[PDB]
Every structure is written in C-alpha cells, then in structure tokens.
Amino acid sequence: TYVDPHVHEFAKELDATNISIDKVVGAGEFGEVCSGRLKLPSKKEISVAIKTLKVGYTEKQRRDFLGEASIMGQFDHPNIIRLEGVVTKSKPVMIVTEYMENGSLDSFLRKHDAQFTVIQLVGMLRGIASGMKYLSDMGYVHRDLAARNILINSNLVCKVSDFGLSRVPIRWTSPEAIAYRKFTSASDVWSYGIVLWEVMSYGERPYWEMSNQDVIKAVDEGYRLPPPMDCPAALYQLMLDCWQKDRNNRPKFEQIVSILDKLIRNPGSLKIITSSNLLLD
C-alpha cells in the first residue's frame, strides 16, 4: 500500500561526491534537468537522470519538488521509474532517477512513425500496463497517465513517470473524473486506453486540437477516438473496453496485462485488422 505524504522514509540520501553531471537537458518545472552518472555503494557506476531545485526556491517549491520523490520512492517495479535517491543536505537539492535514453514515449514514437512492428508496440504497452497494475495494487491513482509521462529506455522498455499529480489533462481523463472528480483506478484504466491509442497512432495527440468543451461533450455523447491506421482489431476493442462509460465495466489492470500477454503469445491474432473524426460507440 501507497501512503499519501500530502522524504527520507522512502528516499536514500546520496553523497554528491558520487554524482557527476554529463549533459544538460534544458529546464524543468522546478529547476534544471540533466543526466550523468552515479557511483553506487558497491562501486558500480550507472547512468542517471538528475533534476535540481532552482536557486532561490520557495518553501512550497521545495515541498512540491521533493514530494514527487516521496511518492516515486514507494514503488519498486521494473515498469515504474526508479528513484536512485535525493540530495537534500547540500544545495542545489537534487532528485536522481533511472536514466531513460529514448525519453518521453510520445515524442519518441513521433520520430519513428510506422517504423516499429506491432509486436514491439504491444511489448511497450504491456510494460506500461504492468507498471499500472503495480501502482493500482498499491492504492495509488496516477491521474496523469499519458504517453508524455511514460519514458522509454535504450531497449524499448516503457516505465511510468511523473508522480506530481496523484495520490491514495482533459484529453486523458475519464468522463466521471471530469464531471465530478471521481478518480479511481478505473479512471486510470480510461487513461490507459488513451495511451493505447497514442501508441498505436505513433504519438498523435488524442482528439487532436478539438475545443476542450467539445472533447468533454463528444465523449459524454458516446463518441470515441477512431481506430489508428492498420490497428489490430483486438487492440481497438481493448481501447473501447477501457473507454466504457460505466467505470465498473472497464477491465482491471491485471486483465489488461493478461490480454496483452495473450496477444504476445499468439501474434497471429494481431493480423486481424479493424476496417480526424470521432466514431459513435
């Protein structure tokens, strides 16, 4: 079980002598983002992502910044970004996480439109579902599950990131969560359906640039995102199931993992294909 903080309980204090910065990767919400190397206590050296808190931060910025680490540090799963530790006893304050060579999944897929096999895409999707199954098992609702918040490593393994918004983005949010803030693991399953569409669409924006008001109304009326080009029937059906109006009828993450595993095991089933406008379901 996840425990809501809203920390040294769940984050290791790293010695900065063990951190080296290699590359600066622009700015983040709270400070700079870079990558580098971390020397572990066993002397092994690994690549890491490093984020710092800006000079002259406010106490609220510090709390929000480190709050993400206190959440991430609760999880230890191959499809959830690993927290290596924090530096708080010296400034700038830092959060150190596993390095992901290929960055955010949506921007990565946009660079490689139609360049992966359907089995490669399903492998990515299975990793994301496995990470979500763990988070939901822990009682955590993500609330911001989207391809931009999944990171992908050199071996194409996808891992859930960005713990800033959840606890024990209209296009990605379930209708009930929009209507009255009913956030549950089933609203994360809705979001997963959107990520499934993003992946199969190679990082197309869900609902493109539709007015937010129209995204809300259309989805409420029963309209759904259309099948991506050449989308396996099984995967479009999975999207539709994740997008059931009644949250009790959506699959659980465990079922999603199971569905994907069966597709990986019988790849011929992916050969059955479905045949900027929404479809009435």
Last residue of a domain, one of 64, 99, 134: 99
100 is in an annotated binding site: yes
* Same domain (yes/no): 117, 222: yes
Give the method of determination: X-ray
* Same domain (yes/no): 37, 156: no
116 is in an annotated binding site: no
Helix/strand/coil for 266 = coil
26 is in an annotated binding site: yes
* Same domain (yes/no): 49, 62: yes
Last residue of a domain, one of 48, 66, 99: 99
Residue 159's closest CA among 225, 74, 82, 53?
82
Contacts of 266 (CB under 8 A, 6+ apart): none
* Same domain (yes/no): 94, 104: no
Q: Exposed/middle/buried for 230, CB within 10 Å: 0-12, 13-18, 19+?
A: exposed
d(CA 193, CA 227): 12
* Same domain (yes/no): 126, 221: yes
Verify whether residue 144 is a known catalytic residue: yes
* Same domain (yes/no): 167, 271: yes
Tell me the H-state helices in 211-252: 212-221, 233-242
**Cβ 194 vs Cβ 162: under 8 Å:** no
177 is in an annotated binding site: no
Q: Which residues of 166-180 are buried (b: 16+ CB within 10 A; e: fewer)?
A: beeeebbbbbbbbee
In this structure, what CATH number is given to the domain that contains residue 180? Answer: 1.10.510.10
Helix/strand/coil for 275 = coil
* Same domain (yes/no): 78, 208: no
Helix/strand/coil for 223 = strand
Q: Give the bridge partners for 86, in sequence order.
A: 13, 95
30 is in an annotated binding site: yes
Tokens linked to 103: 């960055």
Q: In what order do the strands lie in the sheet with 83-87?
A: 19-27, 32-39, 45-52, 94-98, 83-87
* Same domain (yes/no): 89, 17: yes
d(CA 34, CA 21): 7
The residue range of the domain holding 131 is: 100-281
Q: Give the bridge partners for 58, in sequence order.
A: none
Helix/strand/coil for 146 = coil
In this structure, what CATH number is given to the domain that contains residue 18? Answer: 3.30.200.20
13 is in an annotated binding site: no
* Same domain (yes/no): 163, 178: yes
d(CA 41, CA 182): 44
Q: How many domains does the chain have?
A: 2
| H or E segment and range at residue 46 | strand 45-52
* Same domain (yes/no): 69, 135: no
Catalytic residue (choose from 4, 106, 137, 144)? 144
* Same domain (yes/no): 141, 63: no
**Cβ 75 vs Cβ 135: under 8 Å:** yes
Distances (CA, A) of 45 to 38, 48, 89, 149, 207: 6, 9, 22, 26, 43
* Same domain (yes/no): 8, 32: yes
Question: In the chain, which residues are followed by a C-to-N distance beyond 2.5 Å, i.e. a gap?
Answer: 6, 168, 275
Last residue of a domain, one of 99, 122, 157: 99
